[PDB]
């Protein structure tokens, strides 16, 4: 098995230009906010499985590895909002995250704000990052709760720490609720999936950078004339499922004697990870499924919005 | 009676490949976690009576027999969470378990964390194992409490000891509560019951290894053409009830003159241990009950989830 090759095949990262555009903007946000005056407050979108958490873990690596190895400073922070977040609920988890506090046996929402606003200059927080903004909409109706939104405006105007919010593409109507939240968050971006399969794409260079990143030491055989056809036939532009199927083929090749990912084990990888796909999506690998041109069609605009049509 | 034969008939263990897969993964977790950097933190599932406690007692035998006979080291630990566990409640029982402390007349949850984090390198804990993770969901509603979850993340990030959590299959939504708990627990497995009765199963080899493991010195007569039919008719794939009925037949055979388990005393064993079964489950042994093919049907996916539908 040689589990080093397995973990080294799973932990692989390809920097598409949108990702480095993002990380450049967050360093821009980090040492552009001067902690004297009003911050910049970027907002990042992206659908399910487009690489968001990988982006922020890249960011806390390249921004906080040496400063977390040096001492208890914690300049950048990483937060997910729990579902249907009460303002005291999000505030207390954001508080027990940073520092070494006890911090949550009292739930009073004024005195823990006191403790968090005295601690946010005490350890020297350079940036606060929130992962999951779509948790503030109701399940069965599309009312949105902005107790946490006005609380986040309060902690923004209290201490001038920059905030970078990630979230689903349907989570922006929450920002359409509070207009002061809408104006305070100026930079919204678009981390949409891979667009086309027609040729000379960013998809190409991503694919062959992943190919040299793979643990097989000669060639992976991928990013070819017909392979990206069935690859884009399998995953829409969907980064998580593409990488998942690729990893599930790579483990199958390293289970036995195999020199590269080839045409006997990539099929069984299509057999496993075909579960999340819809019924009208077509299964292209086993016996005779040639792929029409309309099925490599680019992803629509409401690609991170199908959590929202039904209600 | 000859109670040696009774205890030697009760304490019998058959290593199906999923069990040795597990124990290989926990030795992998034990001396893969280096106690310098971030651990691996496996999670194990399994329904009621699938052999979990037997697996961990096998593990503390084969991992800690000689080191517990040598001195007070206690490298591996065994913990069950009490029901509706307060963080101080789970922490104090995890504390009085290891070492020889007094440890629970104070319930302060900061200073006992102090004592436990100075003691976890003092005795040299190699691994902490928790049995019962399903105790953190509410009875009447499906709110889950994650005071203990964030406390377990705290003790995970404080000292870098690997943690192996066992639990019910419906207990994974608790891990879906905290996303940092979800990401910190990477390896989740599937200890599901025995799948089919159709032939050439793992069930076969398990059955005849149990047959040679039985105290009768010629043959047990089991694992035959028609016996596994009524065996899988009695127990679904359910290891506890299968082993229980087998033991209740073996005691009945050794109560009087009997040379093997046979067709007069195995019936009375079906008479006793038919209580836990549902009403629509069919009782197949007494007079004329031939078993249809649909009743050897494989167990469903929500087989460890019927504690969860009603609320
Ligand atoms: N730039 C990249 N290069 C290689 N693999 C990537 C890249 N970005 C993401 N992946 C893969 O995609 C998978 C999904 O990542 P991630 O969870 O960050 O997406 P996401 O949009 O945050 O999904 P979710 O929002 O549901 O968490 C990861 O397992 C990772 O291996
Ligand atoms: N590999 C095995 N070989 C033989 N017997 C076994 C094996 N595994 C389990 N058993 C039998 O199954 C019974 C139930 O064991 P165990 O309690 O570990 O299951 P469990 O899933 O932990 O149940 P619970 O979770 O309710 O404690 C035991 O009495 C044991 O005799």
PDB file of N, CA and C and ligand atoms in Angstrom, chain B residues 10 12-16 19 46-55 131-132 134 168 191 206 210 239-241 243-244, ligand 2:
ATOM      1  N   UNK B  10     -18.324 -19.797  26.030  1.00  0.00           N
ATOM      2  CA  UNK B  10     -18.783 -18.415  25.929  1.00  0.00           C
ATOM      3  C   UNK B  10     -17.699 -17.514  25.345  1.00  0.00           C
ATOM      4  N   UNK B  12     -15.375 -17.247  23.057  1.00  0.00           N
ATOM      5  CA  UNK B  12     -14.804 -17.681  21.791  1.00  0.00           C
ATOM      6  C   UNK B  12     -14.876 -16.525  20.809  1.00  0.00           C
ATOM      7  N   UNK B  13     -13.826 -16.367  20.008  1.00  0.00           N
ATOM      8  CA  UNK B  13     -13.669 -15.218  19.131  1.00  0.00           C
ATOM      9  C   UNK B  13     -13.300 -15.681  17.732  1.00  0.00           C
ATOM     10  N   UNK B  14     -14.033 -15.192  16.737  1.00  0.00           N
ATOM     11  CA  UNK B  14     -13.752 -15.463  15.335  1.00  0.00           C
ATOM     12  C   UNK B  14     -13.384 -14.145  14.676  1.00  0.00           C
ATOM     13  N   UNK B  15     -12.227 -14.108  14.026  1.00  0.00           N
ATOM     14  CA  UNK B  15     -11.723 -12.879  13.418  1.00  0.00           C
ATOM     15  C   UNK B  15     -12.183 -12.823  11.969  1.00  0.00           C
ATOM     16  N   UNK B  16     -13.327 -12.187  11.743  1.00  0.00           N
ATOM     17  CA  UNK B  16     -13.745 -11.837  10.398  1.00  0.00           C
ATOM     18  C   UNK B  16     -12.815 -10.739   9.869  1.00  0.00           C
ATOM     19  N   UNK B  19     -12.822  -7.124  11.265  1.00  0.00           N
ATOM     20  CA  UNK B  19     -12.254  -6.923  12.597  1.00  0.00           C
ATOM     21  C   UNK B  19     -10.745  -6.730  12.526  1.00  0.00           C
ATOM     22  N   UNK B  46     -20.966   0.997  13.743  1.00  0.00           N
ATOM     23  CA  UNK B  46     -21.496  -0.340  13.898  1.00  0.00           C
ATOM     24  C   UNK B  46     -22.773  -0.341  14.703  1.00  0.00           C
ATOM     25  N   UNK B  47     -23.720  -1.196  14.326  1.00  0.00           N
ATOM     26  CA  UNK B  47     -25.042  -1.225  14.937  1.00  0.00           C
ATOM     27  C   UNK B  47     -24.985  -1.926  16.294  1.00  0.00           C
ATOM     28  N   UNK B  48     -26.148  -2.274  16.830  1.00  0.00           N
ATOM     29  CA  UNK B  48     -26.211  -2.914  18.135  1.00  0.00           C
ATOM     30  C   UNK B  48     -25.802  -4.374  18.005  1.00  0.00           C
ATOM     31  N   UNK B  49     -24.859  -4.800  18.838  1.00  0.00           N
ATOM     32  CA  UNK B  49     -24.480  -6.196  18.868  1.00  0.00           C
ATOM     33  C   UNK B  49     -23.691  -6.679  17.676  1.00  0.00           C
ATOM     34  N   UNK B  50     -22.825  -5.837  17.108  1.00  0.00           N
ATOM     35  CA  UNK B  50     -21.988  -6.246  15.985  1.00  0.00           C
ATOM     36  C   UNK B  50     -20.567  -6.558  16.406  1.00  0.00           C
ATOM     37  N   UNK B  51     -20.299  -6.633  17.702  1.00  0.00           N
ATOM     38  CA  UNK B  51     -19.012  -7.053  18.192  1.00  0.00           C
ATOM     39  C   UNK B  51     -18.025  -5.959  18.514  1.00  0.00           C
ATOM     40  N   UNK B  52     -18.491  -4.757  18.863  1.00  0.00           N
ATOM     41  CA  UNK B  52     -17.577  -3.634  19.050  1.00  0.00           C
ATOM     42  C   UNK B  52     -16.750  -3.785  20.317  1.00  0.00           C
ATOM     43  N   UNK B  53     -17.411  -4.047  21.451  1.00  0.00           N
ATOM     44  CA  UNK B  53     -16.715  -4.162  22.727  1.00  0.00           C
ATOM     45  C   UNK B  53     -15.743  -5.326  22.725  1.00  0.00           C
ATOM     46  N   UNK B  54     -16.107  -6.415  22.049  1.00  0.00           N
ATOM     47  CA  UNK B  54     -15.204  -7.542  21.885  1.00  0.00           C
ATOM     48  C   UNK B  54     -13.967  -7.156  21.095  1.00  0.00           C
ATOM     49  N   UNK B  55     -14.137  -6.300  20.083  1.00  0.00           N
ATOM     50  CA  UNK B  55     -13.005  -5.802  19.310  1.00  0.00           C
ATOM     51  C   UNK B  55     -12.061  -4.997  20.189  1.00  0.00           C
ATOM     52  N   UNK B 131     -16.057   4.368  23.631  1.00  0.00           N
ATOM     53  CA  UNK B 131     -17.067   3.424  23.178  1.00  0.00           C
ATOM     54  C   UNK B 131     -18.342   4.080  22.673  1.00  0.00           C
ATOM     55  N   UNK B 132     -18.973   4.938  23.463  1.00  0.00           N
ATOM     56  CA  UNK B 132     -20.391   5.229  23.271  1.00  0.00           C
ATOM     57  C   UNK B 132     -20.583   6.696  22.893  1.00  0.00           C
ATOM     58  N   UNK B 134     -23.117   7.758  20.877  1.00  0.00           N
ATOM     59  CA  UNK B 134     -24.517   8.048  20.615  1.00  0.00           C
ATOM     60  C   UNK B 134     -25.239   8.624  21.822  1.00  0.00           C
ATOM     61  N   UNK B 168     -22.770   4.274  17.478  1.00  0.00           N
ATOM     62  CA  UNK B 168     -23.894   3.832  16.677  1.00  0.00           C
ATOM     63  C   UNK B 168     -23.847   4.496  15.306  1.00  0.00           C
ATOM     64  N   UNK B 191     -18.738  -1.112  10.022  1.00  0.00           N
ATOM     65  CA  UNK B 191     -18.832  -2.452  10.608  1.00  0.00           C
ATOM     66  C   UNK B 191     -20.293  -2.894  10.582  1.00  0.00           C
ATOM     67  N   UNK B 206     -16.586 -17.791   8.826  1.00  0.00           N
ATOM     68  CA  UNK B 206     -16.887 -17.420  10.207  1.00  0.00           C
ATOM     69  C   UNK B 206     -17.596 -18.552  10.932  1.00  0.00           C
ATOM     70  N   UNK B 210     -16.138 -20.796  13.999  1.00  0.00           N
ATOM     71  CA  UNK B 210     -16.884 -20.951  15.242  1.00  0.00           C
ATOM     72  C   UNK B 210     -17.152 -22.417  15.541  1.00  0.00           C
ATOM     73  N   UNK B 239     -24.929 -10.359  15.016  1.00  0.00           N
ATOM     74  CA  UNK B 239     -23.885 -11.177  15.621  1.00  0.00           C
ATOM     75  C   UNK B 239     -24.226 -11.577  17.050  1.00  0.00           C
ATOM     76  N   UNK B 240     -24.802 -10.647  17.818  1.00  0.00           N
ATOM     77  CA  UNK B 240     -25.103 -10.896  19.224  1.00  0.00           C
ATOM     78  C   UNK B 240     -26.161 -11.976  19.382  1.00  0.00           C
ATOM     79  N   UNK B 241     -27.249 -11.890  18.619  1.00  0.00           N
ATOM     80  CA  UNK B 241     -28.307 -12.884  18.729  1.00  0.00           C
ATOM     81  C   UNK B 241     -27.910 -14.237  18.158  1.00  0.00           C
ATOM     82  N   UNK B 243     -24.745 -15.511  18.091  1.00  0.00           N
ATOM     83  CA  UNK B 243     -23.865 -16.075  19.100  1.00  0.00           C
ATOM     84  C   UNK B 243     -24.611 -16.433  20.376  1.00  0.00           C
ATOM     85  N   UNK B 244     -25.642 -15.663  20.727  1.00  0.00           N
ATOM     86  CA  UNK B 244     -26.418 -15.926  21.929  1.00  0.00           C
ATOM     87  C   UNK B 244     -27.207 -17.219  21.796  1.00  0.00           C
TER      88      UNK B 244
HETATM   89  N1  LIG C   2     -15.653 -12.007  16.184  1.00  0.00           N
HETATM   90  C1  LIG C   2     -16.505 -12.632  17.025  1.00  0.00           C
HETATM   91  N2  LIG C   2     -16.471 -13.968  17.193  1.00  0.00           N
HETATM   92  C2  LIG C   2     -17.322 -14.587  18.028  1.00  0.00           C
HETATM   93  N3  LIG C   2     -18.256 -13.949  18.755  1.00  0.00           N
HETATM   94  C3  LIG C   2     -18.395 -12.607  18.682  1.00  0.00           C
HETATM   95  C4  LIG C   2     -17.505 -11.860  17.788  1.00  0.00           C
HETATM   96  N4  LIG C   2     -17.840 -10.568  17.893  1.00  0.00           N
HETATM   97  C5  LIG C   2     -18.857 -10.492  18.782  1.00  0.00           C
HETATM   98  N5  LIG C   2     -19.191 -11.703  19.246  1.00  0.00           N
HETATM   99  C6  LIG C   2     -20.270 -11.959  20.224  1.00  0.00           C
HETATM  100  O1  LIG C   2     -21.264 -10.943  20.092  1.00  0.00           O
HETATM  101  C7  LIG C   2     -21.691 -10.490  21.378  1.00  0.00           C
HETATM  102  C8  LIG C   2     -21.900  -8.979  21.383  1.00  0.00           C
HETATM  103  O2  LIG C   2     -20.631  -8.336  21.440  1.00  0.00           O
HETATM  104  P1  LIG C   2     -20.491  -6.741  21.592  1.00  0.00           P
HETATM  105  O3  LIG C   2     -21.233  -6.268  22.814  1.00  0.00           O
HETATM  106  O4  LIG C   2     -19.031  -6.394  21.452  1.00  0.00           O
HETATM  107  O5  LIG C   2     -21.285  -6.145  20.334  1.00  0.00           O
HETATM  108  P2  LIG C   2     -21.547  -4.567  20.318  1.00  0.00           P
HETATM  109  O6  LIG C   2     -21.863  -4.141  18.909  1.00  0.00           O
HETATM  110  O7  LIG C   2     -20.434  -3.900  21.072  1.00  0.00           O
HETATM  111  O8  LIG C   2     -22.886  -4.439  21.184  1.00  0.00           O
HETATM  112  P3  LIG C   2     -23.089  -3.119  22.063  1.00  0.00           P
HETATM  113  O9  LIG C   2     -22.658  -2.016  21.136  1.00  0.00           O
HETATM  114  O10 LIG C   2     -24.562  -3.131  22.367  1.00  0.00           O
HETATM  115  O11 LIG C   2     -22.192  -3.339  23.254  1.00  0.00           O
HETATM  116  C9  LIG C   2     -20.623 -10.908  22.372  1.00  0.00           C
HETATM  117  O12 LIG C   2     -21.228 -11.578  23.479  1.00  0.00           O
HETATM  118  C10 LIG C   2     -19.714 -11.865  21.631  1.00  0.00           C
HETATM  119  O13 LIG C   2     -19.762 -13.154  22.244  1.00  0.00           O
END
